[PDB]
């Protein structure tokens, strides 16, 4: 009982520095043990698809003309993509006044 609080305290502080340096150094473990599967899941898909989802639009040639046209598609393509969109909401609701 002679050491008393010094049984823990000196080991307590010295445990903290190791609790900092290597605990977080070994913390990168989970960055590639539970994410190594993400390496075979997310990393591969982006290589396999993120470039290919650019290449998917070789069929969508005119769609690819809208992503770059975002400067003007908010009125041009919108008047195409929303005029038909407005086909629905103003059809059923505005006709409900007939029974009145």
């Amino acid at each position: 009982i002679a050491r008393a609080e010094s049984v823990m305290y000196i080991q307590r502080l010295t445990s903290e520095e190791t609790l900092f340096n290597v605990w977080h150094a070994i913390s990168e473990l989970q960055d590639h043990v539970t994410r190594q599967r993400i390496g075979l899941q997310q990393l591969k898909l982006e290589i396999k698809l993120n470039s290919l989802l650019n290449d998917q639009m070789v069929s969508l040639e005119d769609w690819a003309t809208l992503e770059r046209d975002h400067v003007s598609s908010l009125v041009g393509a919108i008047s195409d993509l929303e005029a038909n969109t407005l086909r629905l909401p103003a059809t059923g609701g505005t006709k409900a006044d007939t029974e009145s």
């Binding site: 050491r3 445990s15 390496g39 598609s73 038909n84 086909r87």
Partner: protein, 298 residues
């Protein structure tokens, strides 16, 4: 791996038992018991005991070795000075070390009787060894008896009752329970010692199924199995946290997704409901067979 985990946690408990029990536990036992077969001591006690221990054992008390150098070191330093005439001066060691266990370590000797048991008889080998190392560490162990007569002058005789905690320095064979219970409250040191911290084989140290061995390699190449996604997450996670980057991400992804998120994400929520017009176009041709032919067919 996990020896990188032990860099700084071993400097307050590892140096708490060996540095003190090396001289009262069994060293007097083995020295006195070594009289029967003393051949190894012939070629070692000349230099290994008094001199070779200076690099490791004599540096522990070097902090207090200045003011009290000649406390008990006198019984060893003085015979060494007469090495040129050491042939005719060899009968004074056992007498010059008798006071060591009579004044310097007399309270210590009482605790050390168990270690003195097999060497109380053969003190010749024991006191010779006591000259080399036991007297030197006793210089550290004589600090408590020596300092009482000097520093607490107003409280010299009064403190002898309170010095029971301070008396542990000579009587140093019953304090082992200190470190004995220590490495449970701070078992967070290692596993190779009596403690445990470098434990387990599945998620601590031999987590080599992908965790520990890779963790060592997560500084060279095994950390690249996944983290490269972020660079090809330029449409994604890298430009996630920065929405302004996400804003220009959509601007810069104007080969893959900008249209879907900016030209028709603004209409995708009210778009799917026009599958009905597909049915209405092909629903008015049912009555081209029944009406006029069966106006009164019933």
């Amino acid at each position: 791996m996990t020896m990188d985990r032990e860099k700084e946690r071993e400097l307050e408990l590892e140096s708490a038992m060996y540095t003190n029990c090396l001289l009262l536990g069994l060293d007097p036992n083995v020295i006195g018991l070594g009289a029967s077969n003393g051949t190894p001591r012939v070629g070692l006690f000349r230099h290994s005991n008094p001199k070779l221990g200076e690099q490791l054992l004599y540096f522990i008390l070097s902090s207090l070795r200045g003011p009290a150098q000649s406390s008990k070191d006198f019984d060893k330093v003085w015979p060494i000075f007469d090495s040129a005439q050491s042939r005719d001066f060899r009968k004074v060691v056992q007498a010059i070390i008798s006071e060591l266990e009579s004044q310097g370590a007399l309270p210590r000797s009482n605790s050390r009787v168990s270690s003195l048991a097999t060497c109380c008889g053969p003190r010749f080998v024991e006191l010779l060894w006591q000259l080399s190392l036991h007297a030197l560490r006793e210089v550290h162990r004589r600090t408590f008896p020596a300092d009482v007569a000097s520093n607490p002058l107003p409280s010299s005789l009064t403190d002898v009752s309170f010095s029971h905690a301070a008396t542990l320095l000579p009587v140093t064979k019953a304090r082992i329970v200190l470190e004995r219970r220590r490495f449970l409250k701070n078992a967070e040191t290692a596993v190779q010692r009596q403690a445990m911290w470098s434990n387990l084989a599945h998620e601590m140290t031999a987590e080599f199924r992908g965790l520990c061995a890779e963790e060592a390699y997560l500084q060279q190449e095994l950390e690249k199995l996944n983290d490269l996604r972020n660079k090809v997450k330029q449409e994604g996670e890298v430009w996630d946290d920065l929405v302004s980057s996400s804003s220009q991400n959509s601007h810069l992804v104007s080969k893959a997704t900008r249209l879907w998120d900016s030209i028709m994400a603004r209409k995708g929520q009210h778009e799917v409901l026009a599958s009905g017009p597909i049915e209405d176009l092909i629903a008015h041709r049912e009555h081209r067979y029944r009406i006029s032919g069966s106006a009164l067919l019933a």
